[PDB]
Amino acid sequence: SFKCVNSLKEDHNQPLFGVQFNWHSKEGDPLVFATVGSNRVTLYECHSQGEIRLLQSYVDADADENFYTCAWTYDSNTSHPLLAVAGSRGIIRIINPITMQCIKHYVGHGNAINELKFHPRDPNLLLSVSKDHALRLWNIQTDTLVAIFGGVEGHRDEVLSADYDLLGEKIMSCGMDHSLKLWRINSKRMMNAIKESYDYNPNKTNRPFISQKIHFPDFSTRDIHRNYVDCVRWLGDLILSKSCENAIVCWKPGKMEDDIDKIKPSESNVTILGRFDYSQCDIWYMRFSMDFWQKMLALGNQVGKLYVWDLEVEKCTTLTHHKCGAAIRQTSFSRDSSILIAVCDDASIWRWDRL
Amino acid sequence: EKGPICWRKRVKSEYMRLRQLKRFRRADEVKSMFNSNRQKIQERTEILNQEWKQRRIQPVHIMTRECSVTSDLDFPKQVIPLKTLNAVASVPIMYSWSPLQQNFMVEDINDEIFVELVNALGQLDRRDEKPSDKIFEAISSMFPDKGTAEELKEKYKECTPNIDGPNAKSVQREQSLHSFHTLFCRRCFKYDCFLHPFHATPNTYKRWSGAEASMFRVLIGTYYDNFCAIARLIGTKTCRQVYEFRVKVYNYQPCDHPRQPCDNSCPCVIAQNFCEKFCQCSSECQNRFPGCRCKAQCNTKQCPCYLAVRECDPDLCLTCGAADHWDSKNVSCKNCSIQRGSKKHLLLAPSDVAGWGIFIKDPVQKNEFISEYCGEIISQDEADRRGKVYDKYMCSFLFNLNNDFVVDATRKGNKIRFANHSVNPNCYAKVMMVNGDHRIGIFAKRAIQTGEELFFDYRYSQADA
Amino acid sequence: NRLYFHSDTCLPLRPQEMEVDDEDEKDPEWLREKTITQIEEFSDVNEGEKEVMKLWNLHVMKHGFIADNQMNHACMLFVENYGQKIIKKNLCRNFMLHLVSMHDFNLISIMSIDKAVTKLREMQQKL
Ligand SMILES: CCc1cc(C)[nH]c(=O)c1CN1CCc2c(Cl)cc(OC3CCN(C(=O)[C@@H](C)O)CC3)c(Cl)c2C1=O
Ligand SMILES: [Zn+2]
Ligand SMILES: [Zn+2]
Ligand SMILES: [Zn+2]
Ligand SMILES: [Zn+2]
Ligand SMILES: [Zn+2]
Ligand SMILES: [Zn+2]
Ligand SMILES: [Zn+2]
């Protein structure tokens, strides 16, 4: 299954909150991953015999910044990879690793950003999830705010995680209010708002772009977890989510036979398909991840144990190492699933090679 | 005929069978869904992989203050330069909130298996020979909490249709009208209104097919004996056909005490409040507020409305301007700003003190109305509960409305929520009685210039003991 | 002489916009959907009554009627604006029940019932 092939340590000694492999990387190009912790963004390149090559590192001019999340995209024209980062200050930064500069920045969230996700089909649509109780959909081409997902029937506490589905037709969000909310982005309202954001040119007008204020989700539940929900990922049309109750719950909106795209907003039902058990992960802000093919699932715990599940169960390996005893904050799989990276509370990086 | 111990055993045995069946059945549905879902993962994941194959995205290269990376697995120490991300100015902290133009009131074995079990027990009862009571007594013996042997017979044995529908029944006038009667708020002309908790008192709503019949029973209550008008409205019956069918500071709350005057026992009189247009008392009630006979203004002690700390009522104040020109906000009467929502344009920007602040777009005169301080209407208890959380954040955006309610601008409110506190303000807050509702008006304490920050003394709104 | 921000998005105003932040409209859309949703939550209310109530509330919220003297005009304007929806969604009789309930509440005159019903019937003739 997996061999621990390298361990790295960043000089700041602060928790590393995010890891993301660049899945846009060409077939044959070396496998690159980004790291976020302290007020730093670090880029790495994977090589044979466990070799991790330190490529780039950025530091916010503000010492009080603390990056929590990052996400990779690409510029449609230039064909350059782009990396979005954000944390405690509520500012989104779009870094260009080819040009080695901050190419864009968005201020607008009234609090810390806990998650950043790029639309699986449109590289310009960026979703940010905030401590302010709202989600924001940005158009990174026209620098417009397409929609605000929050309000009367939005999250009542800090939004901790969100995920688009495979084709980018809908978003599933979760948070400290114990809620998991569905926000459809293939609706006529949302498709037009995306279209209109692309037509927007502030030079050809004196009026601001009109952002959609989506106060109502397309489904909402509080009956999956008894505490805060800190990670949510779609598994096809099913949902994978966790709290501090030492389990990842696999579930779906409505009754067993209810189709995801036929679920009415007033739906009071949920169907729990099953759960993935583990231990010592009762601390807040602990994220699970999947490979591109959604066949593998990984989750680290507060004492450095790394759990890997084979999702094709229509199996659990406990990856462990004597020198790894810190809280594993997040994991990342290479596109091809050959490399698995884990980041910790002690500025350490752990490389696990599949063989 | 089988005995009680036997039946209890059968109940157990059958319920255990139905449960282990549902279990293994459902386990399979689960495996079927994961499998059917896996195909969707495959299909969509190939669409994405195909789109990725059509892209040639540029690889990242090495960079060139510095930083190092160390290895606990003895790989060599690495050193590169640390590129500085240029400072970006942040905005003050702000949490999600919903815009409001008016206040918003906020208040402080299953049946599927049970039926299956009964039917399974009936099949054993049937097979025994070579709806039975000896079955209900056994289910109640094994599930006492679910109910008694009688209650389970009742449970096992198991609205008004629209007059426009095919199931339209012939019913009583009150049956037909009930939903409209109990959901309508006379005070704000809406059904299930966001402002008034209590339902309207029964005196407030008083002054041949199923559908034709029900409409007749309704129309006779309004057009007592004008069968010409009853026929006109029914449309499918005549002047004669219809005739032939016949032959076969406390919060205000409307008072309703039939055959009793508004005396010392009247809730309005007790609450030391005037009776309003919504009260069900006599038209000659001596406690009703008469309104004002002003020609214009209504902004001095000369106006009984203004003097009573009330806005002008549009149904009583017929000469000042409060009743006319609904298209306009600048009306002859200067005592109807809250009710009309004649607010001044306000602007959001970081305060010159801390956090966010509110700035007036255009000049305002001393005592001129700026905006209403809108929010959620919550009970004193809800405010005590909410306050526990608020203190953790050092935020306090809730203000006493009267003895019974607090307006809280934290979750819902309007732009004026951004007016900061000051013991040296340029604004003041005035709770007014506005058509039976207590509403907070924010007025200029002195003339104010274009772009000036707004501040009011929070303590005056908090000080109610 | 200061950077202003939109209250709904917290994004800054350009000098082009010249101190205009008016996402402070009389009827916030969310209230329109909150009302629609709430009426639907009732088990004891039928689908006919529900749709008339929803349409009436949406009408009252749009025009912001605040006086009882505006109630006669409100019913007339309800026919003009929502009459097509009433006829098409088959809520002609439920609307009739709403008018008499309004008369019971002392908000509208007896002639308003006739006038509104007469107006809806000739609107149906146009179809
Ligand atoms: C009226 C807004 C206003 C006014 C003025 C004059 N000046 C300003 O700067 C602001 C902005 N502002 C200040 C900071 C802030 C904090 Cl620190 C906590 C808040 O609200 C908690 C958020 C968690 N709460 C919850 O209930 C969650 C945990 O469920 C309780 C209320 C809020 Cl609502 C705010 C906020 O928006
Ligand atoms: Zn009301
Ligand atoms: Zn009385
Ligand atoms: Zn009274
Ligand atoms: Zn009275
Ligand atoms: Zn007057
Ligand atoms: Zn008056
Ligand atoms: Zn007046």
Residue numbers in the entry:
A (entry chain E): 67 to 380, 386 to 426
B (entry chain A): 9 to 72, 81 to 124, 166 to 180, 193 to 199, 219 to 246, 260 to 308, 432 to 472, 517 to 733
C (entry chain S): 562 to 688
The authors write:
PRC2 is composed of four core components: EZH2, EED, SUZ12 and RbAp48, although it may interact with several other proteins. Each catalytic cycle of PRC2 transfers a methyl group from the cofactor S-adenosyl-L-methionine (SAM) to the ɛ-amino group of H3K27. The catalytic machinery of PRC2 resides entirely in the C-terminal SET domain of EZH2, although EZH2 itself is neither stable nor active. Here we report the inhibitor-bound crystal structures of the wild-type (WT) and the oncogenic Y641N PRC2 consisting of human EED, human SUZ12-VEFS and engineered American chameleon (Anolis carolinensis) EZH2 (AcEZH2) subunits.
The structure in complex with compound 1 reported here shows that the ligand recognition is nearly orthogonal to the SAM-binding mode. The pyridone group anchors the ligand through its reciprocal hydrogen-bonding interactions with the backbone of Trp624 from the conserved GXG motif of the SET domain. Thus the partial overlap of the cofactor- and inhibitor-binding sites is consistent with SAM-competitive nature of these inhibitors. Nonetheless, the rest of the ligand occupies a hitherto unanticipated pocket that is partially formed by the I-SET region from the SET domain as the base, and the activation loop forming the lid of the pocket. The oxygen atom of the carbonyl moiety of the lactam present in inhibitor 1 makes specific interaction with the backbone NH of Tyr111. Tyr111 from the activation loop and Tyr661 from the I-SET region are in contact with each other making a closed cavity that is accessed by the ‘pendant' piperidine ring of the compound. The hydroxypropanoyl group emerging from the cavity makes a specific interaction with the backbone carbonyl oxygen of Arg222 from EED. All three sites of acquired resistance mutation provide interactions for the molecular recognition of the inhibitor 1. The C-terminal end of the structure reported here, often referred to as the post-SET, is largely disordered. Thus, analogous to kinase inhibitor terminology, pyridone inhibitors could be classified as type II PRC2 inhibitors that not only compete with the cofactor SAM, but also occupy the extended pocket that is unique to PRC2, accounting for their exquisite selectivity.
